[PDB]
Amino acid sequence: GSAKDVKFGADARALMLQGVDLLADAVAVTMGPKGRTVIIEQSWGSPKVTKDGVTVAKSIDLKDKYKNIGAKLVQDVANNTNEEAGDGTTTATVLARSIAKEGFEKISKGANPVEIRRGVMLAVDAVIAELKKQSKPVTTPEEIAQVATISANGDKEIGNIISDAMKKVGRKGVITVKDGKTLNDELEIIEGMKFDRGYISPYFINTSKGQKCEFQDAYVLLSEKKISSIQSIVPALEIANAHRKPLVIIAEDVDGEALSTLVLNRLKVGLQVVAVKAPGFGDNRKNQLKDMAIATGGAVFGEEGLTLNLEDVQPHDLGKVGEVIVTKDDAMLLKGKGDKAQIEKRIQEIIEQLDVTTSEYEKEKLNERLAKLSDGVAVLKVGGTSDVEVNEKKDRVTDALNATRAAVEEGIVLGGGCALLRCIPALDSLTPANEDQKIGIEIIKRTLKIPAMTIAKNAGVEGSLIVEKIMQSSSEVGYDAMAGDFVNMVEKGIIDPTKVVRTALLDAAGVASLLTTAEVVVTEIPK
């Protein structure tokens, strides 16, 4: 019901292209090894410094609504590329700008933009098939380090630390990025099963050097419900005392008279016992507790289904660990004596649960449980002098992790925009159905040179001459923009994930070729 302004044809298209051009010009300064950064004002505190294309894209909104429509569409391109691949958003932005500009130039009275878009999509499918033919699987960890180094803007230490993390926890393992309080990056490998619950009582500390409770060859008692009575905790303590063996109690909570019994027995006679709360806040807590039961060889007590009571506990119902460390904030179990076949069955059960989940949040929980049961987790702490530097480097570390995961999944192609450059002869062999599809194919053919030209332009050289000399070169030769030299790209480690390149192309082409079909733009009157 709001009053609207309606614009027609070339004027509306030119305003939308002005918005697209402003956003893409801001994004394009960040591309490549000699890309620069963008400072974004934040309303609350310090400004944000970033080389990340989607971050620059999402921060730009325009007062002019016709320009803002084009800005929102290229924002959609960058956001879709980021959600699908986690990298290549700057490439997607410059490809989308190129497709939008070439499509806007080709609209005449006799032109049919919908069939032009059909030609664009056919050419993009041909290029993606050529990219999949060009791709090679990742076999060596040196390739992993090269991919992570390229995606972290040439930082060899980030590539090395990501390669080390994937050596330790697996190429499909769990690696997380968090703030580091030091100046340098540090990799922490957490093995076994560590969770974020400390000791319930500080009296359980027996190693006063680190203010922690340490046992070797300890029994494990696992309860799905709270332990608060004398009769629910005394027989397990009798088993632990008669076997002369430490006991770790992990339950929902230990409180009331049971806690007083535990503290009294530890303080007076010196009974080796520690009580830890269970991790999780729902069915994840039950799943992790059953994972602990399988890994240690114990049984869950007070469960809803089997209904096993803590009054009648046998020595075979308790798990066995070789080492347990309980601090104020966390506890960790080492060398659980559970059956290996049962641990493998639980691992394949977690895998098959992962195959049927699409919530994108329970998948993280299942991957964490699988990592705790199988290989552990890696934590990358990013160093830096200040928070702005830490966030800027964290963006590149996240980009390198996403690119390395994508390269593990789908292989690698040539870096530096050369993979798209080598797909041009695949477009040269196509036969268009009509003139509009020929126009769309030629639009994509012109667009395929854009990433290499942008990388060369940010390096201070003439992009067109560089691109033509790459095209006259052999298929293994591209341009090192950092060195200013024409090199073997695979030998120098300038490589890109195939998934990132094809995602950027597809996400750019769909939105931009839809945008070039427009004849009328409707916007609200600014109030």
Applying CB under 6 A, the residues found at the interface with ligand ATP are 30-33, 35, 51-54, 87-91, 150, 154, 399, 415-417, 451, 455, 480-482, 494, 496
CB of 519 to Mg ion, least distance (A): 16
155 is in an annotated binding site: no
**C-beta atoms surrounding 75 within 10 Å:** 20
CB of 487 to a copy of itself, least distance (A): 16
**Which position's Cβ is nearest ligand ATP?**
415
Calpha distance 42→46 (Å, rounded): 6
CB of 307 to ligand ATP, least distance (A): 53
Distance of CA 252 to the CA centre of its chain: 32
91 is in an annotated binding site: yes
When the beta carbons of 87 and 143 are compared against ligand ATP, the nearer one is 87
Calpha distance 151→441 (Å, rounded): 30
Task: Based on the shown chain and the rule CB under 8 A, indicate whether residue 3 belongs to the binding site for a copy of itself.
Answer: yes
When the beta carbons of 20 and 378 are compared against K ion, the nearer one is 20
Calpha distance 274→263 (Å, rounded): 9
Calpha distance 473→462 (Å, rounded): 17
Q: Which tokens hold the place of 335?
A: 């060398």
Site residues (CB under 8 A) for a copy of itself, limited to 122-181: 153
87 is in an annotated binding site: yes
CB of 485 to a copy of itself, least distance (A): 13
When the beta carbons of 9 and 425 are compared against a copy of itself, the nearer one is 9
Task: Based on the shown chain and the rule CB under 8 A, indicate whether residue 465 belongs to the binding site for a copy of itself.
Answer: no
When the beta carbons of 99 and 144 are compared against a copy of itself, the nearer one is 99
When the beta carbons of 30 and 261 are compared against ligand ATP, the nearer one is 30
Site residues (CB under 5 A) for Mg ion, limited to 62-101: 87
51 is in an annotated binding site: yes
Distance of CA 131 to the CA centre of its chain: 23
Site residues (CB under 8 A) for a copy of itself, limited to 315-354: 327-328, 348-349, 352-353
- Burial 412-421, CB ≥16 within 10 A → b, else e: bbbbbbbbbb
Three-state DSSP class for residue 245: coil
Calpha distance 386→396 (Å, rounded): 16
- Burial 344-380, CB ≥16 within 10 A → b, else e: eebbeebeebeeeeeeeeeeebbbbbbbbbbbbbbbb
CB of 96 to a copy of itself, least distance (A): 11
Known binding residues for ATP: 51, 87-91, 416, 496
Q: Residue ranges for the binding site?
A: 51, 87-91, 416, 496
